[PDB]
Design a protein around this motif. Sequence first.
Motif, mmCIF file in Angstrom:
data_model
loop_
_atom_site.group_PDB
_atom_site.id
_atom_site.type_symbol
_atom_site.label_atom_id
_atom_site.label_comp_id
_atom_site.label_asym_id
_atom_site.label_seq_id
_atom_site.Cartn_x
_atom_site.Cartn_y
_atom_site.Cartn_z
ATOM 1 N N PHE A 92 -49.999 21.841 5.967
ATOM 2 C CA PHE A 92 -51.225 21.981 6.747
ATOM 3 C C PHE A 92 -51.200 21.101 7.988
ATOM 4 C CE2 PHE A 92 -55.655 20.928 7.750
ATOM 5 C CZ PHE A 92 -56.170 22.197 7.914
ATOM 6 N N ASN A 93 -50.565 19.932 7.904
ATOM 7 C CA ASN A 93 -50.467 19.041 9.054
ATOM 8 C C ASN A 93 -49.490 19.543 10.108
ATOM 9 O OD1 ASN A 93 -52.323 16.977 8.290
ATOM 10 N ND2 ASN A 93 -50.814 16.189 6.827
ATOM 11 N N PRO A 153 -48.940 23.016 11.589
ATOM 12 C CA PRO A 153 -49.331 24.434 11.595
ATOM 13 C C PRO A 153 -48.344 25.367 12.275
ATOM 14 C CG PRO A 153 -50.569 23.228 13.233
ATOM 15 C CD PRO A 153 -49.845 22.200 12.411
ATOM 16 N N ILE A 154 -47.433 24.864 13.104
ATOM 17 C CA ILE A 154 -46.554 25.704 13.909
ATOM 18 C C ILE A 154 -45.117 25.479 13.464
ATOM 19 C CG2 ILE A 154 -45.706 26.221 16.223
ATOM 20 C CD1 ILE A 154 -48.484 25.277 17.252
ATOM 21 N N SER A 208 -51.605 30.763 9.503
ATOM 22 C CA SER A 208 -53.014 31.136 9.466
ATOM 23 C C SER A 208 -53.498 31.709 10.794
ATOM 24 C CB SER A 208 -53.871 29.929 9.077
ATOM 25 O OG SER A 208 -54.084 29.072 10.186
ATOM 26 N N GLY A 209 -52.645 31.691 11.820
ATOM 27 C CA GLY A 209 -53.043 32.247 13.103
ATOM 28 C C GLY A 209 -52.320 33.541 13.424
ATOM 29 N N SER A 262 -50.203 34.139 15.666
ATOM 30 C CA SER A 262 -49.731 34.231 17.040
ATOM 31 C C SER A 262 -48.278 33.783 17.131
ATOM 32 C CB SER A 262 -50.604 33.377 17.959
ATOM 33 O OG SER A 262 -51.979 33.657 17.764
ATOM 34 N N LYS A 314 -43.679 21.640 13.699
ATOM 35 C CA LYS A 314 -44.332 20.929 14.791
ATOM 36 C C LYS A 314 -45.711 20.466 14.353
ATOM 37 C CE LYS A 314 -45.870 21.508 19.583
ATOM 38 N NZ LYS A 314 -47.345 21.580 19.392
ATOM 39 N N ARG A 328 -49.732 19.177 14.836
ATOM 40 C CA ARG A 328 -50.856 19.852 15.473
ATOM 41 C C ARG A 328 -51.017 19.428 16.927
ATOM 42 N NH1 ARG A 328 -53.747 22.033 12.248
ATOM 43 N NH2 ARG A 328 -53.732 20.333 10.716
ATOM 44 N N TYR A 329 -50.976 18.124 17.195
ATOM 45 C CA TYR A 329 -51.273 17.592 18.519
ATOM 46 C C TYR A 329 -50.034 17.196 19.309
ATOM 47 C CZ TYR A 329 -55.993 17.351 16.614
ATOM 48 O OH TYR A 329 -57.205 17.664 16.043
ATOM 49 N N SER A 330 -48.844 17.615 18.885
ATOM 50 C CA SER A 330 -47.655 17.369 19.685
ATOM 51 C C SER A 330 -47.710 18.184 20.974
ATOM 52 C CB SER A 330 -46.395 17.707 18.893
ATOM 53 O OG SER A 330 -46.336 16.958 17.693
ATOM 54 N N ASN A 334 -40.322 17.603 20.274
ATOM 55 C CA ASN A 334 -41.661 17.602 19.702
ATOM 56 C C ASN A 334 -41.687 17.993 18.231
ATOM 57 O OD1 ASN A 334 -42.718 16.880 22.173
ATOM 58 N ND2 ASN A 334 -43.273 18.975 22.752
ATOM 59 N N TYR A 335 -40.566 18.436 17.672
ATOM 60 C CA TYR A 335 -40.512 18.924 16.301
ATOM 61 C C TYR A 335 -39.964 17.829 15.399
ATOM 62 C CZ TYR A 335 -41.456 23.617 18.027
ATOM 63 O OH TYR A 335 -42.036 24.718 18.612
ATOM 64 N N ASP A 336 -40.663 17.568 14.295
ATOM 65 C CA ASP A 336 -40.335 16.437 13.435
ATOM 66 C C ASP A 336 -39.330 16.794 12.346
ATOM 67 O OD1 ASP A 336 -42.008 14.787 14.864
ATOM 68 O OD2 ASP A 336 -43.695 14.976 13.473
ATOM 69 N N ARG A 377 -59.394 23.692 0.878
ATOM 70 C CA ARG A 377 -58.990 24.466 -0.290
ATOM 71 C C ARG A 377 -59.207 23.699 -1.589
ATOM 72 N NH1 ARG A 377 -53.005 26.233 1.346
ATOM 73 N NH2 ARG A 377 -53.105 24.114 2.206
ATOM 74 N N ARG A 422 -44.552 7.288 19.807
ATOM 75 C CA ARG A 422 -43.552 8.304 20.106
ATOM 76 C C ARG A 422 -43.732 8.777 21.540
ATOM 77 N NH1 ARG A 422 -43.364 12.844 16.420
ATOM 78 N NH2 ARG A 422 -42.752 14.099 18.232
ATOM 79 N N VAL A 430 -43.959 12.231 23.846
ATOM 80 C CA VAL A 430 -44.308 13.642 23.744
ATOM 81 C C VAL A 430 -44.042 14.293 25.092
ATOM 82 C CG1 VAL A 430 -46.178 15.289 23.421
ATOM 83 C CG2 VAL A 430 -45.966 13.318 21.905
ATOM 84 N N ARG A 461 -47.098 8.014 23.774
ATOM 85 C CA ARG A 461 -48.195 8.294 22.858
ATOM 86 C C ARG A 461 -48.238 7.267 21.740
ATOM 87 N NH1 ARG A 461 -49.395 14.148 20.558
ATOM 88 N NH2 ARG A 461 -49.625 14.215 22.833
ATOM 89 N N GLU A 509 -57.317 27.192 16.694
ATOM 90 C CA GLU A 509 -57.617 27.418 15.286
ATOM 91 C C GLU A 509 -59.118 27.604 15.134
ATOM 92 O OE1 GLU A 509 -55.620 23.742 13.915
ATOM 93 O OE2 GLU A 509 -54.400 25.056 12.649
ATOM 94 N N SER A 537 -59.278 35.148 14.760
ATOM 95 C CA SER A 537 -57.866 35.012 15.078
ATOM 96 C C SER A 537 -57.588 35.769 16.367
ATOM 97 C CB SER A 537 -56.979 35.546 13.947
ATOM 98 O OG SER A 537 -57.241 36.916 13.700
ATOM 99 N N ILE A 538 -56.886 35.124 17.293
ATOM 100 C CA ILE A 538 -56.668 35.695 18.619
ATOM 101 C C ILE A 538 -55.606 36.783 18.524
ATOM 102 C CG2 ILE A 538 -55.695 35.250 20.895
ATOM 103 C CD1 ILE A 538 -57.153 32.562 20.869
#
Lengths: 120, 339, 342, 339, 340, 336
Positions: free
Chosen positions: A26-27, A29-30, A51-52, A54, A96, A98-100, A108-110, D136, D191, D193, D202, E177, E182-183
């Motif tokens: 969940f942390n 999302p992409i 969940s999106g 896109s 990735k 959420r706020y990266s 940017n990918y952990d 959830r 880090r 960004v 950041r 989100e 959903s777009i």
Amino acid sequence: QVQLVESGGGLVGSLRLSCAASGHTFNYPIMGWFRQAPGKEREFVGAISWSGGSTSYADSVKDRFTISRDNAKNTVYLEMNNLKPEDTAVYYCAAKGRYSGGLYYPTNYDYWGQGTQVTV
Amino acid sequence: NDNITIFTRILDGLLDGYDNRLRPGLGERITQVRTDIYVTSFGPVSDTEMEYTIDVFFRQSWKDERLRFKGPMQRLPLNNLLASKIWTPDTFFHNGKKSIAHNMTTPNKLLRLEDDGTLLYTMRLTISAECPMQLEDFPMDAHACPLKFGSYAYPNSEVVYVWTNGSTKSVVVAEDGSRLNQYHLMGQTVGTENISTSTGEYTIMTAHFHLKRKIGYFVIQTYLPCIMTVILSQVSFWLNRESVPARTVFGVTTVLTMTTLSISARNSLPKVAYATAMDWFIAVCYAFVFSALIEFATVNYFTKSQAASISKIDKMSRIVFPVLFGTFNLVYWATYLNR
Amino acid sequence: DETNDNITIFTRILDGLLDGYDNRLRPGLGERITQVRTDIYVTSFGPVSDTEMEYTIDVFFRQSWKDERLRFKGPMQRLPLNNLLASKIWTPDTFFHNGKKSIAHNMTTPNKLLRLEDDGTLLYTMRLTISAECPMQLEDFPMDAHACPLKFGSYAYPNSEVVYVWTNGSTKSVVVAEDGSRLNQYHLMGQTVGTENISTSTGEYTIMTAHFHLKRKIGYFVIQTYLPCIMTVILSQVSFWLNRESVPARTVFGVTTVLTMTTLSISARNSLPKVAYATAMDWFIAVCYAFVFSALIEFATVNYFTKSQPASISKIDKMSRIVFPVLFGTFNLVYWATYLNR
Amino acid sequence: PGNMSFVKETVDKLLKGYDIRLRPDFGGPPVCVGMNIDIASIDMVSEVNMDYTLTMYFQQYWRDKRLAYSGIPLNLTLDNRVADQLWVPDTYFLNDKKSFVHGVTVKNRMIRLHPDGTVLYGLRITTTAACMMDLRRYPLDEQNCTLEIESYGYTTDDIEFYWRGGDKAVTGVERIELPQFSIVEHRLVSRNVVFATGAYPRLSLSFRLKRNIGYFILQTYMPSILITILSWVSFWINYDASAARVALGITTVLTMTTINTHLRETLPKIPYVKAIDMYLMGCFVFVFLALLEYAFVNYIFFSELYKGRAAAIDRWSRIVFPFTFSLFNLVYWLYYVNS
Amino acid sequence: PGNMSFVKETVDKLLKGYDIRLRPDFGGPPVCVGMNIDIASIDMVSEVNMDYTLTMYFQQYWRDKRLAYSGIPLNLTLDNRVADQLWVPDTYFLNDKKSFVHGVTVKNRMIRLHPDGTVLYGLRITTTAACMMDLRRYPLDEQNCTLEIESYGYTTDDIEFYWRGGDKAVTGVERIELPQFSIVEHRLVSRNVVFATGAYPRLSLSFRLKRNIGYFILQTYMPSILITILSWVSFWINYDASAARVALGITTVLTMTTINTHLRETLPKIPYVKAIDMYLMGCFVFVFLALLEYAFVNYIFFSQELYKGRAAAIDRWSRIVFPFTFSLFNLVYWLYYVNS
Amino acid sequence: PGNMSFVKETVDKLLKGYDIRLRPDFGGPPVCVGMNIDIASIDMVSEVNMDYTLTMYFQQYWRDKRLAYSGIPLNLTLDNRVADQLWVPDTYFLNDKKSFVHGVTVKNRMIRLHPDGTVLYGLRITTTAACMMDLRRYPLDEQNCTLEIESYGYTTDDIEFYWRGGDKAVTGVERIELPQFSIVEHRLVSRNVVFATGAYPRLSLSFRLKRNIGYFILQTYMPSILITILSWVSFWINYDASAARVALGITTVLTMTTINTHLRETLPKIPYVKAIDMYLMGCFVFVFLALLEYAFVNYIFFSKGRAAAIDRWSRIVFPFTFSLFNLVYWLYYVNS
Ligand SMILES: *[C@@H]1O[C@H](CO)[C@@H](O[C@@H]2O[C@H](CO)[C@@H](O)[C@H](O[C@@H]3O[C@H](CO[C@H]4O[C@H](CO)[C@@H](O)[C@H](O[C@H]5O[C@H](CO)[C@@H](O)[C@H](O)[C@@H]5O)[C@@H]4O)[C@@H](O)[C@H](O[C@H]4O[C@H](CO)[C@@H](O)[C@H](O)[C@@H]4O)[C@@H]3O)[C@H]2NC(C)=O)[C@H](O)[C@H]1NC(C)=O
Ligand SMILES: *[C@@H]1O[C@H](CO)[C@@H](O[C@@H]2O[C@H](CO)[C@@H](O[C@@H]3O[C@H](CO[C@H]4O[C@H](CO)[C@@H](O)[C@H](O[C@H]5O[C@H](CO)[C@@H](O)[C@H](O)[C@@H]5O)[C@@H]4O)[C@@H](O)[C@H](O[C@H]4O[C@H](CO)[C@@H](O)[C@H](O)[C@@H]4O)[C@@H]3O)[C@H](O)[C@H]2NC(C)=O)[C@H](O)[C@H]1NC(C)=O
Ligand SMILES: *[C@@H]1O[C@H](CO)[C@@H](O[C@@H]2O[C@H](CO)[C@@H](O[C@@H]3O[C@H](CO[C@H]4O[C@H](CO)[C@@H](O)[C@H](O[C@H]5O[C@H](CO)[C@@H](O)[C@H](O)[C@@H]5O)[C@@H]4O)[C@@H](O)[C@H](O[C@H]4O[C@H](CO)[C@@H](O)[C@H](O)[C@@H]4O)[C@@H]3O)[C@H](O)[C@H]2NC(C)=O)[C@H](O)[C@H]1NC(C)=O
Ligand SMILES: *[C@@H]1O[C@H](CO)[C@@H](O)[C@H](O)[C@H]1NC(C)=O
């Protein structure tokens, strides 16, 4: 952590890759797909949002590849359709936060996958 | 006759060479800031937010040796346009959530200068301040809401605050200032404290307002409806035992009323994670109301599913239930009301 | 044209045009009345709030006047100046009398337009969101119509100093966008604009007026109130077909329906201001309550007569079973005919 | 000496020719800016808005050689309006929704100049920051809320953020008394960004929140359990009392919906089913089946073995329903406790 | 000497005599302002207010001869307070209701100069933009909210807008989100709008939002279906139980009435029947007619072999007619809206 | 003739050397400030907030001899920026909670100089002012609450306030209308108030409001009366119908408690009983006693002429005593 595992690689046309995730997804999302070859920089391929739905792509794979997901199984898929010879690389799967920053930058990918090789 | 022009040259002579970036006595001595408060309005207290609103004339006084003068008049009040050109302390309220410094026809500020160089600087503020609350005794509890204020930048070694006249008479409450409808302001206390923080040692001026909650509102709002609901369950014992549809209606509808009251009461309060004294009343009233229904189902089963021997149950319930509820109601107030 | 030198001689024109210029004085202070031409483009109208009796309107508010200090001669005839010139130049203090709370949109530089012509004419425009008080009568609440006013004029300058006129005449000076009918429960029949003088403690003033005519759309209240009310009345009347020995069944029909009418009467509490008089919807609800309540008194007397004098009393069921649908039917004809023609 | 005239002229030379438009060491290596935070409170945490409100003292440390001075032993503290005359880094919070710097008395800012040129810039800020939450497991969940700190304009080639003091850079989290939550852990991250315009420094501060189940036990679960138990009272009432067992059934069914209508208000309009929603529908099934039980019994009885079958089903329902709800209740908690 | 002093005197030379009152190349050809957006989030979408709140990084990119400099190969990153000293486009959002530039610490603005004079100007923005919604399909609807970007003061004779990179000019759509929506896609448009005062350039950003039905299934449809099924318990109870049959029926009708009126309190009082309203009125007829079912059988049973025969036949028919017809109505409802 | 240049230099000469920091006649006798108010409208009077919102045009007059001019016959109106370059009084509203000057296009201020030096300073102000309400008679109450005008800094030896025209100073109160209230009376007062820092001049503007009972009759009283009358139907249903006699009786009890919460949840948490509380509690007693009456007859019957006798007296006693209760209620609160 969010463990990432890859599958579906190998020498080839059309091909399909699968990337599974577990843990605190969940942390993150992409999910993004990256590819690399020796002596070359790591390239961006595409991304998908939990969940999106896109998606975004690199111009070199517009209309050739498509990324899809199964939100219940927690797996990301890259429909590597319409291959070309220049697609030889190891296709790392990454996550990735959420706020990266931007999508197109591997820094940017952990969390990263094992990088299954494909040959064409 | 020349007052309107002589003080123009006197005051212009004070403000040239003057630097407002430097506190008075920056090098040689500590700056003593006399202070006091006049509370024009207090309340409302938003317990759902754990905060209270206070409206005050906040007054500060100190000596600036750079502004001393000699002239034909001992003290002169000056337009607030001047307050921006002199040094004034950076006092702030440590526990303040939101605040308004009032503009209306001007910024609500007052500045007067004595010929000794002493300054008296005042402003009207509306302060919304946090007041953490313990609510184990909600309907009949008490609180001590603080007001903490001190310098933001200058540490203890540079500026120190003191109540203008030391004792409690340095904080005054307006007689008509009580906007509190739900509380009594039973008293107040004022004190001073040293603190150590990341950026240095500081001085806090503390004022505590002691609040006692009104019990009248909750008695008619919740307690009477609950007590009446309990009695409405017990009145069903004087109906004949064979009228099953009626007896069942009392029990089921009366329980439902307790459900709404249980939900409705805690819909207020700041959603704290524990049972208040109000809950320990409603919850038990639910037990009496609920057990009153189980009482009927028991007697109904022993006559329509199995009578002179067991009809005694109905007679005893007409006495035992009221007496036990009365004893609980008596001991409940005895423990929390005498707190 | 003359691009390389145009940007240099123009700044030479401007500083030579407003140095010595005083913005504390009207143009033509001691010689003429300053005639200001005003115009409005309604970007969007609404929403309207009945409980606070106010409505929101978003407009490009446009003003034009001639300032003799600012006539110039140069390479081009009209100058689209930046909007910070407005602080240097004198502009009218037009204010909206009805405004409760207004915003001069101030995002990404102020939403203000300022142009200067060769002959000294100014055109000054800005984007405003105005929450204006609209006093409204509610006797015909679900079927009423209103005329919300918008009034504006000079604040400081009286009639003998500044006067206002519609730039292209009355009926070609307020323009509403086709997409500007931003209303949910209202439909804008039209608008009329006029002019007025007023007298106050500080002298006479000239007021521009724009009224918008609104007709309420009845659809919402029909499904929200009238159907529940009409259905509840019908629901109560079903009890007349049940046998009269089923006392508990006949009772709950009346009690439950009376309960439904009670909450429905309360339910209108959230849709209206706390007015001191009864509206049209209140009359309908009250009469529906009367029929539902009388449907229970019907059972009470038939129960009383059958138990007390046990039958021919069954005629009461027959008559009430046919009369109640008829009288409630004729009430609807009279009610709707009264208001829908109004 | 430290005469105020000497201090005035010293400060004047520092600001004389100073350029706020250029960062320290412009063109040279990056400016090292050391962040430091003291948490004053977390005013509220709301799921309906997916955000939380945070009040804090926020400080920044950096060296600007243009402000170095000699001959003054002091660490100069100046009127906070000097901030408008100096370069200060453009730090901002990425995920904030709306924020403000407190302005009571005077804007809560602090600048303190040290002889070597080090500048301490601090200000008190209240921020409402977005925190997306995984509902959830609503009453039984854990959440990660973060504050993201970044420089708006300057990239890593110009500014480098770092936590001054490492893991000690944030204080006061020891002292946050949230009513519905508890701070299990916090940690500090740094880090770089990268966007299309460049790589930006950041810092981020993260809190891990674990909920207190007390409120939901009192207000949602116990009401659901008690009403579910009340529905079983029908099985004890004799089958012949049709109006009683129907009234007991319909009332309980509509009480369960009455609980859902309240839960419809406390949370955002999420698509997926939450843990509490799953339990309520679990209770609704038992309450709904408790009325289907009578319907078949009434059908069987009135539609002489039929009399025995009606009694037998009552005996079965009298044991199966309490046993199955206990089994359902047991499996439910073990899932959300063990997982 | 010294690069710090060299830059300072260079910047002063740019600004000395610089007229903020005049657009770049004033009098000459229009200045092209390229712009791009990085979306941070859409805070909320409100039907009651017919609007949505958008937070974004908004950037503009234009060319100014007067800001060109030489001798410095760097792209000067100046303090954001220089924005008060430069000409910047009068760009604004036409459909915006309420917005602000974030101001914590220091106002969130960026200026990046380059040797040839081209300027990059950035802002972080939160805007509550009006979005009218076609609620006739609610909650099975999709909506088209937009952000309308325009220049207030300068016409097409002075300003030209364009998206930098075309379709690539907007990013961050991947990180929006929302619970309800959903777009499906986003679209970029460029136009000229004509008012009485002239023709102005426009850029439009559009989002197509499709709603998620999960919430309404659990909160509205499931209750109504379950309560409607609850009405069918009446057909199985013995016909002599007038008190029970009526009490079950009227209470069910009462529950449907409260559900009907309740939901409209959470959403604007739009004067037309929505898709869910049709369903709730559809359910009301079934529960209402299920009560008349007992009204007639009681009339036939007592007031009118018809006492024994017709009374049983009508009740037995209802046990198959009502469940079947409800499914027939339910099937048509979803095929109408979901499949078409 | 073309005097625009002349008036400009005249204004420049006035403002040249003018000091904002010193009041008119500084050191001398106090400056007299005359005030007018034109009430625009009064918005929601809120019990839950104990306040009311007021919009008005607020005007102030005083003489500053530094601004005298002789060569111009006009009352010289000037742009509102000039107000920032003159001394204006620090008048403030003591009991205000939130207020602002309107700025729809430009900030709504008036500055108008006159040859003798008198200055007219006008503002359009929206103010939310504290109005503590004595709800001991709600909804049948009359409320008096005021706007408290005062000088913040200057004591009575520096400024004097006074109403211009006395009781003609305030206008527009005769026009405003409110849904819940009507204006019965308004008074203008002036007086000094003493604080530790000195005595200050104050002007008090008071309105006395009477509530319109028409609303609560429809919304509160009539539903309560009807529910009470609904309960009396129990005495006419036969006393053998326990299922019916109860369901009617308990439902009325349920409604009476239902409406109590709907009102008190939209009203401040005062501890004492309002007039409606004295009524709704009375109606509940009748509703409760009507239900308790049925539990009484069951015990009499199931233990008959006595059962009927109790029932038949209840048919007339309850309506009679409720009428007596209703009579004394309005007799106290309304007619006395
Ligand atoms: C709330 O949410 C957060 C988000 O889910 C939780 O996790 C944190 O999230 C942030 C992002 O928001 C994430 O960075 C952080 O992880 C720590 O980050 C540190 C910085 O690492 C970066 O910079 C390094 C530069 O040297 C770089 O090496 C890192 O990895 C990259 O390079 C390596 C080497 O080539 C590659 O293998 C890797 O794939 C990357 O390309 C990265 O770019 C870092 O300090 C830290 O730990 C690492 O570094 C330490 C020092 O070397 C080592 O000792 C350690 O073993 C690691 O290598 C993390 O990686 C996480 N935080 C954590 C602790 O994982 C929050 O935890 C959560 N909060 C709460 C309270 O619940
Ligand atoms: C949400 O809702 C909004 C509002 O309804 C939707 O916005 C619309 O999007 C569409 C694209 O999906 C836009 O159409 C495109 O518009 C531009 C600009 O065209 C205009 O400007 C031109 C330059 O001045 C001008 O030449 C055009 O006029 C010519 O073309 C029209 C065509 O009808 C013709 O009638 C005229 O005589 C002129 O010849 C016009 O004024 C343009 O780039 C696009 O053209 C492409 O498509 C056409 C299709 O026929 C094709 O022929 C072209 O070759 C080219 O490929 C296209 O027309 C439309 O303008 C938008 N409407 C508004 C009001 O803004 C939005 O799509 C919705 N979003 C979502 C996500 O659902
Ligand atoms: C709402 O509620 C508010 C608050 O309660 C009401 O406000 C009150 O209004 C009344 C009038 O209705 C005010 O009293 C009036 O005040 C003046 C001035 O008196 C004061 O000032 C004098 C100097 O100017 C001073 O001499 C006075 O002191 C003398 O008088 C008092 C009282 O008798 C006495 O105790 C002293 O020893 C002195 O002898 C005092 O300080 C006054 O003009 C009014 O009438 C007096 O004077 C006239 C002659 O001028 C004479 O004819 C009268 O008989 C009488 O002697 C009157 O006293 C009162 O001050 C207000 N209270 C507050 C707190 O502000 C308001 O009226 C209510 N409004 C509504 C609409 O209901
Ligand atoms: C109030 O007025 C002052 C002028 O001194 C100015 O700071 C601003 O316009 C207003 N600020 C506040 C505190 O509202």
